[PDB]
Design a binder for this molecule. Structure first.
Ligand code: W1Y
Ligand code: W1Y
Ligand code: ZN
Ligand code: ZN
Ligand code: ZN
Ligand code: ZN
Lengths: 69, 69
């Protein structure tokens, strides 16, 4: 039905919100510290000197183990 | 249809995976450091000495800003 389409689109958007904002291919699993933005996979986070959301310098990257992984 | 039910169930489980494992009411937004388990809201994480998943000592809690928030 039309409701099946609405739910498929909601599910798609929630899964896309878990994808790395730089490569668009891998799951987010890394936090930029100290700002706390958690928007990248480990490979893209290792290559950024400043946060792609807030431009704060990245002091270090913290791996996150999320139940959604 | 039956497919609408299947999608409703999938959506529900993905949303439940984002809830604090301790209070079951607030969204996860905190990481235990250095282990990296990200399973609690700020209030429940504040008072734990050891990680509730792996028992490692919590040296500090890092706030996380997730796109799913
Ligand atoms: C926070 N996530 C942003 C993001 C990264 N990638 N995509 C994406 C990828 C393929 C198709 C549609 C969307 C969304
Ligand atoms: C990782 N999240 C675990 C969790 C916490 N709470 N709930 C939950 C709450 C209400 C209804 C169904 C499930 C799941
Ligand atoms: Zn990436
Ligand atoms: Zn940032
Ligand atoms: Zn809680
Ligand atoms: Zn842990």
């Amino acid at each position: 039905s039309q409701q099946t389409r609405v739910l498929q689109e909601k599910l798609r958007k929630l899964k896309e919100a878990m994808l790395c904002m730089v490569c668009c291919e891998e799951e987010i699993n890394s936090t930029f510290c100290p700002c706390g933005h958690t928007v990248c996979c480990e490979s893209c986070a290792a290559q950024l000197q400043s946060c792609p959301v807030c431009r704060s310098r990245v002091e270090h990257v913290q791996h996150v183990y999320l139940p959604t992984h």
